[PDB]
RNA sequence: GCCCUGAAAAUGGAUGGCGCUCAAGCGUGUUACCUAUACUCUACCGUCAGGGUUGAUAUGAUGCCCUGACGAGUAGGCAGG
RNA sequence: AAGCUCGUAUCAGUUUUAUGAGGUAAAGUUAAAUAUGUAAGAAGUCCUUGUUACUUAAUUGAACGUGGACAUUUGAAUGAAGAGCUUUUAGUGGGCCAUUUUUGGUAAGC
RNA sequence: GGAAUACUGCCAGCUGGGACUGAGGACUGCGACGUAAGUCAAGGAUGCUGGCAUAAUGGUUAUAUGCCGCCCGUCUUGAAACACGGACCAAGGAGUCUAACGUCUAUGCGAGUGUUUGGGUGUAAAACCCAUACGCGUAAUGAAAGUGAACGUAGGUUGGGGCCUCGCAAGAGGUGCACAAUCGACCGAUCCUGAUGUCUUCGGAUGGAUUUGAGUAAGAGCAUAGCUGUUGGGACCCGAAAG
RNA sequence: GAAAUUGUUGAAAGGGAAGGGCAUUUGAUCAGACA
């Protein structure tokens, strides 16, 4: 809506908010990022540290498939159970019956350990795990089956 | 709503300063002074009249 | 609609007026006005005449008589503020005056009561008037200012 | 001054307060009576000009 | 003329009233401008100015933070107040009973609170239950956990995480971010 | 309801006591002033009869007035004037005299005219021009409840107690002197004297310390 | 100390002009008086701050009222029309 | 401009007391005037008995603590349209004059 | 030996004349005066009289008179300038749209969020309904191979709105969200140590460190809309010598 | 069928411009109001 803009408050004033000395002109500081080493340097340093230069190895033909490894902390990992069935497992938690959580079914590539699942034994299928992730699972009374 | 000066308008001067009535009725503005006999000693006058 | 409406309208109630603190209090005349004193009328019908003060009316005006036998000025209300008091008096004590009020003078040819009391009063005045020589001629004459006269200097 | 203030107060705690524990600026000097006896005012006057070169 | 030690005609820089056009919002602003005036207890005066807060200044108070404040000693019987929205936290697998009063609950935090035998309230019913504020806890959510505040005050040696489009190698890790290329910071 | 009737002459009795206590308390401040002005007279007489001299106690209070406009002031005095609350030409307040406040005046002397007020001017200013500072709001006094609801913690329960605390320069002078909004005066009634104000009072201008001659200048400004 | 001399530049010519000599000049003193949008008091407009007021049975809760203080402004910014 | 947490309160183009630094004017090594740093309390003081891998010849220090005690003349004057905090962006980046000092220049509306 | 005037200053001393203002609109308050009833100059003006009902007052406009008043816009330290543009009139005429984002605000839901590439449907470019994915977010860190967040009531200390207890209150105590400071614990990278163990050089336990990160430490983001700002585009409008 | 601009009539004005502000007199006009 142009009825709300401020150049519809600037009608009648000569210079339209751009000042009478410096005026307003086409490109005072060059087009785009020009002068980034030279007259804009003080700007690039402070607010773009690290802009110039090269860090490490190139990678030819990179594909984000190989690198797909979503992560699911032990924070959640009980969300993957149906909330209607879920409270059946929390109460009456024993072995010989334990929930099989397939974390790849839900799109997760690795089970991390961020913290404190409850004391219920649980069977967790995962591609990858972390050293702390199992220690908390395995001490909860469950195990980690690896899959592919 | 409007400020009524004392020092004129006697009625406002009497809500402030309840002593304004017994001040005037006894005068005390014109109150007389006790009379004294003391004279400056001859050293003080000798200094004042000096060269 | 040619104009929509205001959405709250002012009430046509009228508030009464806050009680005012003011009181009618009797005028204190300036010290130059004493009953039975030659006055000089400064404006109006009779401006210039030299007339004799009589009573101070309830409406704050002053009652004067020429006398009408003399300068032709009847009994008439005059405002104390338009009248120069003079330094010469006549003895007014011979006149009743208790019959008058302001109600008497209300407007509501000349009524025969006002012509009777006009003449009744002069019996007392015209007696006292001729006692000082020329004061019959003086109460009949009109005042004026002359070349060289300075009202801030002159005494009245 | 902190220690002295500690002393005076705890001292004045059996003295019934009236501490006056701040520092106050130099006041205007109170009244007095000089005694001219033995000291007579000595009249002085300005002095004329001189070269003295 | 007068010599001013201050700048003239200078507003206080506060919310005298919300910027929202919400109607039901202004009915609480109307209810707590009344109690703040006549009830002499500061609780009402606190909840009033919390109804004027913008969105960014109203972070949500998760249903887990509500359980801490109840573990807080003596507070297990208090009625927690949140001016803001309560949200669900399932990372807690147990929840107390108590009570909550908030503007908006999420559908998850409504179930969880009702699930335990507790109760969800609005602010209006709190005003009727405790006008003065008897036995209440106000709770604020974390303000500086935002994504933008992470960027506030960028500059050398302040560790403020530059505003940037794409994160990874090859985007502003090189000159000035490490000693080997140029300098560091 | 009891209300109107039973709480009137119950309250109206307490009103009677405030001014019955102001009655006795002002009587004591009038006998206090007069016998002090008398003993200063008797002391100069008893001394001259001993052949000696009597030096007055120095003046413990001044009244400062801002004589100069609001602009082209150097920064250091311009900061002082704002610490005495002199915010405009012709305004002023009472200033206690100690070594602290007395080296301030030496900074601002070109910009002010001050002296030693008598009980006369302290009484006119406060009655005529005296205002209070209540939640800011610069209230006119006009009544004894305005002073008692503010300074009553200190005593000072009438407008006769202000004038006392001001002229005796009592303990509470700071609380009381800051309870008075700065006096807004007018220009002098009969003029300033002299063609030019901004010489020092000793060279024939208006500023500086004019001592007891300030009593006459303020009254034309009041 | 005052005055004169030293002291000569170009269209006609400027203590501002007329004109002024026990001054209407010069040095100094006492007073009276004149008048700015500044000062004091009052009314009104707006701005800011601080408070009062939600009870039907009316018409505004961006409302009504109370109290104070304050008001220059280019480049510039904002709010309301 | 948008506000935010708060509201008796830390402040201040100011003095005073206390205490440093200076090497211009004058003086002929000495040393001003004006400006300048810090302090004037609760983040305080005194006692009492805990911690450590540092320190000690050492139950001795250092740093931080527990328990107890001293509140508004709480530690000088005056003042304070409140104190702090953050985000965000306009214009500007040709200056000129007067005063008190001063270099270049013979001087200058330099 | 007495005085009086003068001068200075004070009175909650007396009285007279002139000019200006009349805000507000039931009562409330504080006083004063009265034995009393009441009255009063005490939280802002009333009473009495008169005239014309008129263009009298008042407006509007031309003239005249007194004082004042330089020509506009622009650049400029400085323009009335012997600086530039403008004879006059009417009509057109200049910070827009968009792609990608920062802050701020409102709204829906909220550990999620986004129906509109598409399909169903329809009164037919609308509206209505919806499966799969996908994008941002919930995990950081190293060039990389790679690894990946609780010693503890998710810790301690100082301060903190608010609430609770006591007390007549003043204030002290209990708890303390957000938030600011500060010391720790946790994950990753770099340098150091190097365990029970082993295909005898793999494995990497443990323990460190004035080191380093855009990290954890009971999630806050996603979508649309708006103001302001930026970048690219003809880019607020008009204008080159050229290629 | 606007404005620049023009002809006619009427009114007023005019000593090297014209035009403007404050103030009131004079001339022309205007309601409102009262009653």
From Swiss-Prot, chain A:
It is found in: Cytoplasm. SUPFAM superfamilies: Ribosomal proteins L15p and L18e. It comes from the Eukaryota. A motif (Nuclear localization signal) lies at residues 6-12, 23-29. GO terms for biological process: cytoplasmic translation. HAMAP family: Ribosomal_uL15 (MF_01341). The keyword Translocase does not apply. Its main location: cytoplasm. Keywords: Cytoplasm, Isopeptide bond, Ribonucleoprotein, Ribosomal protein, Ubl conjugation. This is Large ribosomal subunit protein uL15. Residues 1-13, 20-29 have a biased composition (Basic residues). Component of the ribosome, a large ribonucleoprotein complex responsible for the synthesis of proteins in the cell. The small ribosomal subunit (SSU) binds messenger RNAs (mRNAs) and translates the encoded message by selecting cognate aminoacyl-transfer RNA (tRNA) molecules. The large subunit (LSU) contains the ribosomal catalytic site termed the peptidyl transferase center (PTC), which catalyzes the formation of peptide bonds, thereby polymerizing the amino acids delivered by tRNAs into a polypeptide chain. GO terms for cellular component: cytoplasm; cytosol; cytosolic large ribosomal subunit; nucleus. InterPro entries: Ribosomal_uL15 (IPR030878), Ribosomal_uL15/eL18 (IPR021131), Ribosomal_uL15/eL18_sf (IPR036227), Ribosomal_uL15_CS (IPR001196). There is a cross-link at residue 95 (Glycyl lysine isopeptide (Lys-Gly) (interchain with G-Cter in ubiquitin)). Changing residue 37 to E: Confers resistance to cycloheximide, an inhibitor of polypeptide elongation. Belongs to the universal ribosomal protein uL15 family. The keyword Lipid metabolism does not apply. The gene is RPL28. One of its GO terms (molecular function) is structural constituent of ribosome. It holds the Pfam family Ribosomal_L27A. Residues 1-38 are annotated as: Disordered.
Curated annotation (Swiss-Prot), chain C:
CDD domains: KOW_RPL6. InterPro entries: 60S_ribosomal_eL6, Rib_uL2_dom2, Ribosomal_eL6_CS, Ribosomal_eL6_KOW, Translation_prot_SH3-like_sf. Its main location: cytoplasm. GO terms for biological process: cytoplasmic translation; ribosomal large subunit assembly. N-terminally acetylated by acetyltransferase NatA. The modification N-acetylserine is found at residue 1. Keywords: Acetylation, Cytoplasm, Isopeptide bond, Phosphoprotein, Ribonucleoprotein, Ribosomal protein, Ubl conjugation. The modification Phosphoserine is found at residue 11. GO terms for cellular component: cytosol; cytosolic large ribosomal subunit. Pfam families: Ribosomal_L6e (PF01159). GO terms for molecular function: RNA binding; structural constituent of ribosome. It is found in: Cytoplasm. It comes from the Eukaryota. Component of the large ribosomal subunit (LSU). Mature yeast ribosomes consist of a small (40S) and a large (60S) subunit. The 40S small subunit contains 1 molecule of ribosomal RNA (18S rRNA) and 33 different proteins (encoded by 57 genes). The large 60S subunit contains 3 rRNA molecules (25S, 5.8S and 5S rRNA) and 46 different proteins (encoded by 81 genes). Belongs to the eukaryotic ribosomal protein eL6 family. Present with 37100 molecules/cell in log phase SD medium. This is Large ribosomal subunit protein eL6A. It comes from Saccharomyces cerevisiae (strain ATCC 204508 / S288c). The gene is RPL6A.
Swiss-Prot record, chain D:
This is Large ribosomal subunit protein eL21A. There are 2 genes for eL21 in yeast. Component of the large ribosomal subunit (LSU). Mature yeast ribosomes consist of a small (40S) and a large (60S) subunit. The 40S small subunit contains 1 molecule of ribosomal RNA (18S rRNA) and 33 different proteins (encoded by 57 genes). The large 60S subunit contains 3 rRNA molecules (25S, 5.8S and 5S rRNA) and 46 different proteins (encoded by 81 genes). Transmembrane segments: none annotated. Component of the ribosome, a large ribonucleoprotein complex responsible for the synthesis of proteins in the cell. The small ribosomal subunit (SSU) binds messenger RNAs (mRNAs) and translates the encoded message by selecting cognate aminoacyl-transfer RNA (tRNA) molecules. The large subunit (LSU) contains the ribosomal catalytic site termed the peptidyl transferase center (PTC), which catalyzes the formation of peptide bonds, thereby polymerizing the amino acids delivered by tRNAs into a polypeptide chain. Coiled coil: none annotated. It is found in: Cytoplasm. The gene is RPL21A. It comes from the Eukaryota. Belongs to the eukaryotic ribosomal protein eL21 family.
UniProtKB/Swiss-Prot annotation, chain E:
It comes from the Eukaryota. Its main location: cytoplasm. There is a cross-link at residue 115 (Glycyl lysine isopeptide (Lys-Gly) (interchain with G-Cter in ubiquitin)). It holds the Pfam family Ribosomal_L18. Keywords: Cytoplasm, Isopeptide bond, Methylation, Ribonucleoprotein, Ribosomal protein, Ubl conjugation. The modification N6,N6,N6-trimethyllysine is found at residue 49. The keyword Ubl conjugation applies. GO terms for molecular function: RNA binding; structural constituent of ribosome. It is found in: Cytoplasm. GO terms for cellular component: cytosol; cytosolic large ribosomal subunit. GO terms for biological process: cytoplasmic translation. Component of the ribosome, a large ribonucleoprotein complex responsible for the synthesis of proteins in the cell. The small ribosomal subunit (SSU) binds messenger RNAs (mRNAs) and translates the encoded message by selecting cognate aminoacyl-transfer RNA (tRNA) molecules. The large subunit (LSU) contains the ribosomal catalytic site termed the peptidyl transferase center (PTC), which catalyzes the formation of peptide bonds, thereby polymerizing the amino acids delivered by tRNAs into a polypeptide chain. Belongs to the eukaryotic ribosomal protein eL18 family. Component of the large ribosomal subunit (LSU). Mature yeast ribosomes consist of a small (40S) and a large (60S) subunit. The 40S small subunit contains 1 molecule of ribosomal RNA (18S rRNA) and 33 different proteins (encoded by 57 genes). The large 60S subunit contains 3 rRNA molecules (25S, 5.8S and 5S rRNA) and 46 different proteins (encoded by 81 genes). eL18 interacts with NAP1. There are 2 genes for eL18 in yeast.
């Amino acid at each position: 809506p142009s009825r709300f803009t401020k150049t519809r408050k600037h009608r009648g004033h000569v210079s339209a908010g751009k000042g009478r000395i410096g005026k307003h002109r086409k490109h005072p500081g060059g087009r785009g990022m020009a002068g980034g080493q030279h007259h804009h340097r003080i700007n690039m340093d402070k607010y773009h540290p690290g802009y110039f230069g090269k860090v490490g190895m190139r990678y030819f033909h990179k594909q984000q498939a190989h690198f797909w490894k979503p992560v699911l902390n032990l924070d959640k990992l009980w969300t993957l159970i149906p909330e209607d069935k879920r409270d059946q497992y929390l109460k009456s938690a024993s072995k010989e019956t334990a929930p099989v959580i397939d974390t790849l079914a839900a799109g997760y590539g690795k089970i991390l350990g961020k913290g404190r699942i409850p004391n219920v034994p649980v069977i967790v299928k995962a591609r990858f795990v972390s050293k702390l992730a199992e220690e908390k699972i395995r001490a909860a009374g469950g195990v980690v089956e690896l899959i592919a | 709503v409007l400020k009524k000066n004392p020092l004129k308008n006697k009625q406002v001067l009497l809500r402030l300063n309840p002593y304004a009535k017994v001040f005037a009725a006894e005068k005390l503005g014109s109150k007389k002074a006790e009379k004294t006999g003391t004279k400056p000693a001859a050293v003080f006058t000798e200094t004042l009249k000096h060269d | 609609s040619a104009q929509k409406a205001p959405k709250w309208y002012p009430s046509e109630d009228v508030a009464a007026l806050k009680k005012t603190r003011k009181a009618a209090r009797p005028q204190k005349l300036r010290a130059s006005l004493v009953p039975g004193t030659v006055l000089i009328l400064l404006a109006g019908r009779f401006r210039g005449k030299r007339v004799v003060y009589l009573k101070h009316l309830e409406d704050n005006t002053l009652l004067i008589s020429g006398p009408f036998k003399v300068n032709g000025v009847p009994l008439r209300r005059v405002n104390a503020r338009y009248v120069i008091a003079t330094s010469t008096k006549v003895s007014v004590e011979g006149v009743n005056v208790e019959k008058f009020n302001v109600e008497y003078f209300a407007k509501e040819e000349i009524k025969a009561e006002r012509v009777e009391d006009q003449k009744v009063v002069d019996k007392a005045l015209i007696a006292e008037i001729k006692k000082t020589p020329l004061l019959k001629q003086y109460l009949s004459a009109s005042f004026s200012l002359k070349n060289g006269d300075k009202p801030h200097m002159l005494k009245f | 001054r902190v220690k002295a203030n500690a002393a005076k107060r705890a001292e004045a705690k059996a003295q019934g307060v009236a501490v006056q524990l701040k520092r106050q600026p130099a006041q205007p000097r109170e009244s007095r009576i000089v005694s001219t006896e033995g000291n007579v005012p000595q009249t002085l006057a300005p002095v004329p000009y001189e070269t003295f070169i | 003329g007068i010599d001013h030690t201050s700048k003239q005609h200078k507003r206080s820089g506060h919310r005298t009233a919300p910027k929202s056009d919400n109607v039901y919002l202004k009915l609480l602003v109307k209810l707590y401008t009344f109690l703040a005036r006549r009830t002499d207890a500061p609780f009402n005066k606190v909840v009033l100015k919390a109804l004027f807060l913008s969105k960014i200044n109203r972070p949500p108070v998760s249903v887990s933070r509500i359980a801490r404040a109840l573990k807080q000693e003596g507070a297990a019987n208090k009625t927690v107040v949140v001016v803001g929205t309560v949200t669900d936290d399932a990372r807690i697998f147990e929840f107390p009973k108590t009570t909550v009063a908030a503007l908006r609950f999420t559908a998850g935090a409504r179930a969880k609170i009702v699930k335990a035998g507790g109760e969800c309230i609005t602010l209006d019913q709190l005003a009727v239950r405790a006008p003065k504020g008897q036995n209440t806890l106000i709770l604020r959510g974390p303000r500086n956990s935002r994504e933008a505040v992470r960027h506030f005050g960028m500059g050398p040696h302040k560790g403020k995480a530059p505003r940037i489009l794409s994160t990874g190698r090859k985007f502003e890790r090189a000159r000035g971010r490490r000693r080997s290329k140029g300098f560091k910071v | 309801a009891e209300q109107v009737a039973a709480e009137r002459a119950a309250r109206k009795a307490a009103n009677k006591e405030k001014r019955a206590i102001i009655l006795e308390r002002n009587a004591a401040y009038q006998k206090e002033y007069e016998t002090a002005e008398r003993n200063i007279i008797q002391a100069k007489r008893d001394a001259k009869a001993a052949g000696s001299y009597y030096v007055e106690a120095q003046h413990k209070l001044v009244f400062v007035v801002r004589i100069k406009g609001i602009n082209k002031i150097p920064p250091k005095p311009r900061k002082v004037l704002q610490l005495l609350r002199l915010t405009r030409i012709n305004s002023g307040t009472f200033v206690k005299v100690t070594k602290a406040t007395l080296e301030l005046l030496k900074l601002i002397e070109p910009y002010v005219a001050y002296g030693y007020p008598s009980y006369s001017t302290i009484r006119q200013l406060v009655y005529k021009r005296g205002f209070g500072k209540i939640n800011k709001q610069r209230v006119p006094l006009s009544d004894n409840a305005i002073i008692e609801a503010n300074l009553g913690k200190y005593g000072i329960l009438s407008i006769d107690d202000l004038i006392h605390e001001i002229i005796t320069v009592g303990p509470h002078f700071k609380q009381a002197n800051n309870f008075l909004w700065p006096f807004k005066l007018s220009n002098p009634s009969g003029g300033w004297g002299v063609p030019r104000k901004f010489k020092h009072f000793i060279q024939g201008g208006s500023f500086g310390n004019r001592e007891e001659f300030i009593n006459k200048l303020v009254k034309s400004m009041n």
